[PDB]
Specification:
This is part of a larger assembly, with 9 protein chains of 9 kinds.
Chain C: H1 19-30, E1 34-38, E2 43-48, E3 56-57, E4 65-68, E5 71-77, H2 79-101, H3 107-120, E6 132-140, E7 144-150, E8 156-158, E9 161-164, H4 168-178, H5 185-199, E10 209-214, E11 235-237, H6 240-248
Helix pairs in contact in C: 2-3, 4-5
Chain G: H1 16-27, E1 31-35, E2 40-45, E3 63-64, E4 69-75, H2 77-98, H3 104-117, E5 129-135, E6 144-148, E7 154-156, E8 159-162, H4 166-176, H5 186-198, E9 208-214, E10 218-221, H6 224-238
Antiparallel strand pairs in G: 1-2, 1-8, 2-9, 3-4, 4-5, 5-6, 6-7, 9-10
Chain H: H1 14-24, E1 29-33, E2 38-43, E3 59-63, E4 66-72, H2 77-95, H3 101-112, E5 125-133, E6 137-143, E7 149-151, E8 154-157, H4 161-171, H5 178-192, E9 202-208, E10 212-215, H6 218-233
Helix pairs in contact in H: 2-3, 4-5, 5-6
Classes of the chains: A alpha+beta (243), B alpha+beta (111), C alpha+beta (250), D alpha+beta (195), E alpha+beta (231), F alpha+beta (244), G alpha+beta (240), H alpha+beta (235), I alpha+beta (241).
The structure holds chloride ion.
Amino acid sequence: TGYDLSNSVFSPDGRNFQVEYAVKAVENGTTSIGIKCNDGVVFAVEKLITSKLLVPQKNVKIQVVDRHIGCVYSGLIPDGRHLVNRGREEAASFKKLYKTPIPIPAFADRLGQYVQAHTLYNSVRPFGVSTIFGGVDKNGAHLYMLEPSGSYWGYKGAATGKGRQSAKAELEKLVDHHPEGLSAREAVKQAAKIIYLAHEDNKEKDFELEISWCSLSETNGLHKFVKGDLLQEAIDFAQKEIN
Amino acid sequence: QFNPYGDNGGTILGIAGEDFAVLAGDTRNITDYSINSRYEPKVFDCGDNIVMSANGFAADGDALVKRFKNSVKWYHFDHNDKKLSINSAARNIQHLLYSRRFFPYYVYNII
Amino acid sequence: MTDRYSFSLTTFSPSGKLGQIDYALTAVKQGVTSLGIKATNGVVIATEKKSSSPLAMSETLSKVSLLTPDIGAVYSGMGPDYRVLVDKSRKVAHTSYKRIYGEYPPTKLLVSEVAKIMQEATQSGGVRPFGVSLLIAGHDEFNGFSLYQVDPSGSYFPWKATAIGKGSVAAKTFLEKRWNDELELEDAIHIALLTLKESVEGEFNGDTIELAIIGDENPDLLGYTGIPTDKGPRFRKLTSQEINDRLEAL
Amino acid sequence: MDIILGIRVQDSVILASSKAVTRGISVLKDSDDKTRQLSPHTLMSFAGEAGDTVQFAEYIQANIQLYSIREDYELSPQAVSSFVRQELAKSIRSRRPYQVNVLIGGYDKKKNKPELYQIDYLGTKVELPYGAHGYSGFYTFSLLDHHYRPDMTTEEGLDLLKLCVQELEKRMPMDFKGVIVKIVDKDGIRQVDDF
Amino acid sequence: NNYDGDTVTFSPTGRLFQVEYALEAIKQGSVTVGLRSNTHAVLVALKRNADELSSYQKKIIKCDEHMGLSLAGLAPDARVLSNYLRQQCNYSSLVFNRKLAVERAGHLLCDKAQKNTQSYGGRPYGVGLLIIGYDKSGAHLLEFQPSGNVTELYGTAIGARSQGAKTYLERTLDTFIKIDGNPDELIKAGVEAISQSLRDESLTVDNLSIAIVGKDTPFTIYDGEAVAKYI
Amino acid sequence: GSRRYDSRTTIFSPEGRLYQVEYALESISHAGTAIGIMASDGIVLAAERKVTSTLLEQDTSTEKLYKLNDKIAVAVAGLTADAEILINTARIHAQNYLKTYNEDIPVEILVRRLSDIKQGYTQHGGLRPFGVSFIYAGYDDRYGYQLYTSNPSGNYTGWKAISVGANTSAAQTLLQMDYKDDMKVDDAIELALKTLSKTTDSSALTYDRLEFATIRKGANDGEVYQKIFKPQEIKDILVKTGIT
Amino acid sequence: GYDRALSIFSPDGHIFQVEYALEAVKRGTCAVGVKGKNCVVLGCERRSTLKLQDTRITPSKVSKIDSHVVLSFSGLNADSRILIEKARVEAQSHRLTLEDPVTVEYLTRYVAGVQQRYTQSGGVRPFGVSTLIAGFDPRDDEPKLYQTEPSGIYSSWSAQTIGRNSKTVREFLEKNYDRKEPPATVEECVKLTVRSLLEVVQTGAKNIEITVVKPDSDIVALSSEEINQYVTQIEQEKQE
Amino acid sequence: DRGVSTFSPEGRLFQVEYSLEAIKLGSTAIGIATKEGVVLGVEKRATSPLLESDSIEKIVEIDRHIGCAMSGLTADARSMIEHARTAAVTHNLYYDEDINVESLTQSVCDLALRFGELMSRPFGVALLIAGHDADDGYQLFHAEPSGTFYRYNAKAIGSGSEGAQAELLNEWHSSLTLKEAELLVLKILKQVMEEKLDENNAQLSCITKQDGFKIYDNEKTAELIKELKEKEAAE
Amino acid sequence: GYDRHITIFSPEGRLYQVEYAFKATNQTNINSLAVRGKDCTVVISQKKVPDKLLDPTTVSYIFCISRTIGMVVNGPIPDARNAALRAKAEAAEFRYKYGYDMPCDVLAKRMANLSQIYTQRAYMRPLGVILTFVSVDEELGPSIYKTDPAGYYVGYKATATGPKQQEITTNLENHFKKSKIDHINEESWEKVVEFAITHMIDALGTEFSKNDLEVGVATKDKFFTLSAENIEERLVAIAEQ
Ligand SMILES: [Cl-]
């Protein structure tokens, strides 16, 4: 034993226990989800209201990269911010050299290689976040989810955090009941519902809902936060479904 | 060949009274035979009851004033909000100017 | 990041042993047998092509390697370590000699350069020693034919004949009885094949044996004519057919 | 600076160096000693660009003194001259070379022989019976070529040196304000206080 | 236990013990309170002395004309982080002629602290900070943890016995937020809040430290007889 | 991080010893014995090759005695590969000195330089020390014939006669018994071989198990000659002294 | 580069590496320093376990740093060479930049500073050496004697000893050395230095080295016979 | 082993806490601040009678208006003093004025936590920095290896510190004269010292606006010791 | 026992970290196979999409390194992509420097050398992957070269990698023992793919749908992967005889 004391050490199984321990920090975090729709993507996150003293709608969790990519994550929030800062540098250098905005699959690998690099040495710690991200590019809509190991895949729907099992089950129903697809406005409503349903795992404290979206028709392929009437409409739809 | 220096004209005048001091300067800014501005402030209140004007090449003048104003701010931070005396400001400005001994600020300065 | 292993990984133990070198020598012991014999008019180096799978094309894996036109090398131990040493040995022969003096290095000095590289992996920060022993055969104008062994420590010794790896103890005894100072190259090849048969279990033929010589100049392998002083490489790798022909007179 | 002369006789080496230092159009000093003792039996005179001369001389002095302490032994004049030459040959291809010409007068205690080395700022070394730098040789070498013997006494060497200085004082346009003369022999280094 | 030797090591449950130990240094520190209305933002800090001959350690640091903070924990780490804020505020002014937004200042502190939690050799910061400021979007209050977590709040408290002041502010939330255009009443609420964290000792003239920033009020610190008004 | 795997090669023991230096000396005590004897008219270097083979090419082999320049040679005891690193550095240092001063390097100055390199590996860098002990045999015009030794600690001392490697305790006692100040090279040759013949772990001392060298003013008039003995010449001197 | 912190504090507030360096000094041969009214004498032990030594060429225990200052030591021999070289370089560097030779106090302060630096720098261990630095300041006739140690602390001494069995010879010096009236002559100062070493040395043959330093760069090392005469006279007075 | 910059479970840096233990083993140093000046006094603690005690330099001048006393691993203090002197004189070069005592102390304390894997360990010495400036008058600061510095009316550091500090608690008042402070340092030093206090094993110093920083002669201190003995025998 | 944590020798002369990297290779539970035709080289690999929420088009362990070279990986996807990115960069750099397309065997050797360095240098860990490079080389023809975490590499007539590699290997061995040739004697690549799939079915004892397989094909001057519909056409032909 002692294989789990240092990062980048293979156990006799062929496992990197330090990365597996980073996953435990992710599982401890709040619930965040992603939904791929007809011409875009929708992101949503659970924000735990620890106290009344928290200013509503101020502690924003979802982050934009470039102008067409949205990023959300569960786990150690600072680690997520660090990853998004790098993502922004990667996106800027891509656009600097190649002119066009970074494609989502290209962007996904840039994050993937960076996270994977933090599993190669004992002088660094793996990332304590799973990141859900995506947007619209020339080839259409893309949704990705990235783990502490650097592993990522494309998704129809994605979920991570403490209420991921509940969320995943809900996402699987949408995939089955909508093979032709889901609209952007529908996806926002469904996203609200799923976060509310996933809140049963964090039912002690009440929470604040935060949603964002990129859609070719609804937002011109740019990342925007869901605000005001459209947000309230989604909250009402979500509250109606739990009762 | 690129000439990093220019001449923005202008004239300044400082006179020390018995219990007062004045620092005056014209507001005209020029290149060659053209007027850039009829009113471009050249004498500045830098805080701590000190006034300053860096006359000559305006870009170097604005840079020096900006750096001195900054030096006053950090003097407060580093030394418990102590007032920067005029003699101390003068010595500080010498070191700001001599840092570019081999690529000088092209200005005549008065405080 | 940064390589933060700036300290030695090989150190003296209380008994005066350098553990990592000893363990590297143990890895060499597990390796497939290879040998070298020096004749009056040449040198021969040989080993078994231990194929990991019958689907693998063992011709693509070269255990015997040309370092210079007149110098060749074979090993026992860890193959990957050998491969990178050959790359470095080929390069250092140019950078530290040919680009200075306009000619290829003599065997002993190329051996000295390879030895140095292996010594540094025994003392430098954040590295383990190379897990190979090399046998380097070669010829040069002023020293004639020569055969050298290089160990993981960086130590090297000249041999009339020797063997390393799996069945080296038995093979060295076999060579002591057969070797003399009047051997012709063909006699040395014959003895090499006899010695190597004892350590091989399975198939014993030109396709499972790798054998090369340092002998006469080969003007047919030079690739060009017109310069009298350039007469061709003395290193030559024996073909599968050439080995089988000598196995009938075995 | 301007004038430095050297002559190796039977049992000693004699160095003569001018006393003048000029800034602009004014002679600031007429008693300047253009020399440094490198070791008890080795003296170096110097001439070249302002500042560089003393700087280089003192740097060499420090290095030889460091060697002397480390080994508890005096380097031979030949060894010192080679060290100096290498430093100048090193310097000529530097970003800003040291523009200094030197004469090294030493008495080798091992061989019991005086030795004079002439080295210019490029690192051009020659061992000579007599030598000079700059224009000094143009006026003086004809006299030295005529009068010099290798078996000369120190007193005869000084007389021949006086004749050289007199010729310089007659035919040179520049006033170099006389010379300081120093003798290097088996007993060490001493200055001739009346010349 | 076996996983607290350095910051680069997760525990089997996904915890970072060195960061948690740094968090512990804040709890040992003296109490400090932060609260704001829509016009002003206030810091109140209980300063701690070594003994009766010693001075009371300063808790509040000015970062710019419109921004500053109070500290709890390792004071030298607060000096490093406040120096960084001063530079960032100053970079914004010199390059963009722009006062640094309080929210962006929090993001910069988060990222600086984070780098110390993921690399070998270094250590986490051992201090907690309460940043107040007035920018283009009004008054703000931030809470900084050396884990990297930064939170925008109406009011809060950090340090020893800070739970008492935090509960008080949670009750008073609806009252003190409405104290607009009245700096003295907002400070009173802060002094009353920090009083809920006191035991044995009380607020004296060289014990109490107060700072305020607002609409037409530069960041200013009050110490000595300047706070006798509020005792 | 990496700290976990650091052996810390440059630290003191509680007793004030350097672990790695002591263990390096333990390694050297198993190496073939090398002996140096200084006489009035020259120096002798004798050394024993370790358990050789009949198939070793002796005439082209060199594991013990190395030439640093025309005036200075060394006998090696320890890791040969480590010794060659240091030997090449010493050869360069000698040439640097010659280029700078136009004189051959004094023996002690070369010895001090190599000993300082060894010292450095015991105080900084975190690397293992060189597992080598040298016997320096040399001549210069200041001190004449000189013998020195250096060990992994970087400490060096001068000697009239000295041994390194295996059985130095026994060897040093035998040398201390028969050595005299007015001794000559031919006598010193005999003493060196007789000492090896008694201290050797082998059954008998033969030509193929030895390396031998002399530094003589036995060169035509005031100059010094280095003689690295050939296998046949070692065989002859063994018969001459009456060992075989 | 190798940055590992080797010299660090322990729970009880000790830096063990520095303390173990003092143990290396304890192992080293004995060195003693005694200053008279117009001189300083440095005595050094030579262990007689090493015979067949060439005493002409073997590194002497007392080293000249400049023409007016000397340095002796106890501890690791190889370590002492590094300090001596640095000291010698600094001595010439001072003469070059300030145009005066170093004072004995300055040279000591420099060597002590080097030793201190090696107790809080990464990747290095402390020097296993304590030094005795003696001499006369330029144009001064007051004797100077200083001591340094691995930690980097230094101080001036009327008389001091370091190395193995230094506890015994310090005991001797403390009862024999009078401050109100120090050894008035060179003879008395050397005699007291030899006497102090005879408490520890064993045989008074080639085991004792003596170096006398007088004002104005007057430094000389006594020979075997000269020292042997002191050894003879001391014991003949003792037989009573 | 373990990191040099490691936090303990209680939230303290191991190395900083261990360096404080080294300072407890150091010789006593006391400082008392008054409106007429600040007095600094130290225990020399010579290890042997042959050691010339006047070479023990545990009180040091930083500038004309700032003095400094030390306790602990005194060799570590030399680079701190060198930095302090450089900082003081450099500020005079940049601003044509004396530097504030607090600003000088802050500059010294900025070195403290510059250790890791910069120097390899914290300093093993504490400093009492005493001085005068026009803004805040006579001041006394205690500079620790933690990077923290407290201002004090009176302070003792070293082996007899907690006993001396309790004594300074009772004796100090805001109307102390310079002469009264001098005797008070001598009194408390004599109390905590192992050996008997005299002019050779103890040293006094002070900083006044007029005369600046001055280390006291052994003859001057001897009289103050004799004056102390008589006034204690007076009741 | 720190000789098991970093790449230094154990007393037995072994490198345990290298051996454990070999074990990580089978973590995905996927089997791959490579064979050579006359004019082509075919590589097939099992495809497993266990989650319904996954986009199955993005799940792949076959990579287009250059136009001529394809690579299939056995091991976790992060290390696989690390190796893929490096191989692409090396292949592009080679072409720029030396003026011709990097051969399959030369790239394999280069990646093998990089792997060797991780086994010798302590600060770098081995990648837990086995890399099978395929092409139709302009000099050597159809080519299969495979690299592992030990830094070992060799050319192959055919090969198999994964948990059930032995079953596939023996199946292939037996076929080449019959035919007595070093390749699949077939003109079209379509039929070589059919052979590859058929013999994987026989060896593993499992049937495949279009979504259960992943196929890569190398021809002269291009390497390409097959779509699900291309694979379906391949599966239909197999079933109809
Ligand atoms: Cl390569």
